[PDB]
Each structure stands twice: as C-alpha cells, then as structure tokens.
Amino acid sequence: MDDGRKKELHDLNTRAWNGEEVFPKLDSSIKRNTGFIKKLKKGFVKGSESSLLKDLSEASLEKYLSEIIVTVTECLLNVLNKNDDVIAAVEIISGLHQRFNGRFTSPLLGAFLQAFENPSVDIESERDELQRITRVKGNLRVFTELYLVGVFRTLDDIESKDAIPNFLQKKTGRKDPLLFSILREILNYKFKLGFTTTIATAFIKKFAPLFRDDDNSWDDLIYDSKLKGALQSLFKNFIDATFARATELHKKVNKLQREHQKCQIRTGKLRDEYVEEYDKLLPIFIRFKTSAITLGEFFKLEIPELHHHHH
Ligand SMILES: [Cl-]
C-alpha cells in the first residue's frame, strides 16, 4: 500500500468518523451473516480482503455486529508479521469502519488497546519475554497502520460505554497523542533487561517519517500535529536512557572480563567468579549495544564508547 492509497483510505475513514455513509435490499439471512463470520475467522491474510469487501457491499450484518467486533478483535491481535497480511487487515478494517463507523470502531479500538497494557508481574522466562515482545511489536505495527489510515485516531473516539485499558484511564486536560501514550507504556516494562529497546528500533525502522522532521509525507495522515514532536521527545529520552545503560553495562562487562583474564593467567582455571557473573550480564550488554548502535545510526548521533571483544 502506497502513500496515495493511505490518503484515499484516510479521506474515506475520516468521512465515516464524521458520520457519512461513504461505503457503497441487503442480504440479512443467517447463512450469509454466519458465512461472513466464518470468512473473518480464517484470518486477515493476503487476498482475503476482496471477498470480504463484497460481502460488506451485499450483506446486512447489523445484527451480527457484536460478534463481528469480538471476532475481528481476535483476528487483528493475531495478524502475522507479514507485510501483505497487514495490508489485507487494513483494507478489511477500513471497509468495516466505513460501513459502521464508531459503533464498530469504538469497541474494537478499546479492546485492541488492551494488547498494550504491561504485564503486572515480573519476567519469569526470558524466552517467554522474547515471544511477548514479538507479539507487542506486531500489535503495535498493526495499530500504527490503522492509525495512519484514520481508523484508530484518539481516545476521544471511544464511547464512555466502551472500556479502555487501565494505563490509558483517568486522562484529564491536554491528552498526549495516542501513539505516544502506547509507546510510553510498552517501552517501560522491565526496561533494564533491554528487550524493549527492540520495540523502539523496530518502530523507527518501519515508521521513519514520524521521526524525521523534514519528511512531510505522512502529515495529511496524522491526527494531532503534536505527534512528531511528542515522539521525538519520547525517543530522545529513551535514547539517553539506552546509551546510559549501555555505558553502565560496558564498564561492568569489561571489568569482569579483565578480572577473569588476570585470574586465568595466574591459575590456568577456565572458570572463576568473574566469568560466571560476566556470562549473566553479557547478553544484556549485547542487547543494549545492538540497540544503541541502531538508534545512533538512525538519529545520526555518535554512540558512547562500547568496545568489547567477546567469545
Ligand atoms: Cl496523534
């Protein structure tokens, strides 16, 4: 999907939010409507969009709306990390939004945002944490693509009736852009372990125009003009933190390595207390260093000294 098609959908989706019927007797039969749900349940993958769009132009799905919302919520949260599948999901959600506006999109958005609430427990398995982070990144990607086409815009679109996650509740006065709110939450779960730094790098790589002031290509797609500024502030703070932690870890791993090496010269032993602690810290250091380098390259900044010769 090119920027032209994004803008086409944005215009249609904005009109739908504005109360227009922009989507052009309907079939209200049980067979037709359950047949639609079954099609949704096969998942949002490439090509599946066109068939579903035909149903939206032929079927009267109003009495199955609640079920469609739940079904789509599950499908959306489980979209694969495949660029073509994401595009299909965007076209399908846009169609549904154009047919039903807020009575579909409001509860969908509220339920979808639950995907960004941080766990309220500690990490038990870093293997599981990597899987969790992968899921969050996929959910963030899909959210952002739907933001850019004007489907998912702001908490202000959600009805009071429709629940929103705890981390987004009780907002008064000036609200931050929704993407800022989401990223401030997800970047800050167990930050010191370094797994969330990969959310930051994945996000800037895929959505670069949000981070480059000279890049105006998505300005017409952005809901609140403060977004680019807010995101730049958030990420520059995150970079300061990432650089600082990388430097702290760099000093620790080098110190432990040096003591281990001196020990091995003295005694000939392969193992000692220094390399045992080193082994626990090194993967964390590597996560921070890799991310420090990527963030530095993207924002054209020099990295702190992070030399380390390992293995
Ligand atoms: Cl915004």
UniProtKB/Swiss-Prot annotation:
Signal peptide: none annotated. It is found in: Cytoplasm. It comes from the Eukaryota. The lineage of its organism: Eukaryota, Fungi, Dikarya, Ascomycota, Saccharomycotina. The chain holds residues 1 to 310 of 1089 of the full protein. It comes from Saccharomyces cerevisiae (strain ATCC 204508 / S288c) (Baker's yeast). Involved in nonsense-mediated decay of mRNAs containing premature stop codons. It interacts, via its C-terminus, with NAM7/UPF1. Could be involved in determining the efficiency of translational termination or reinitiation or factors involved in the initial assembly of an initiation- and termination-competent mRNP. This is Nonsense-mediated mRNA decay protein 2. Present with 1280 molecules/cell in log phase SD medium.
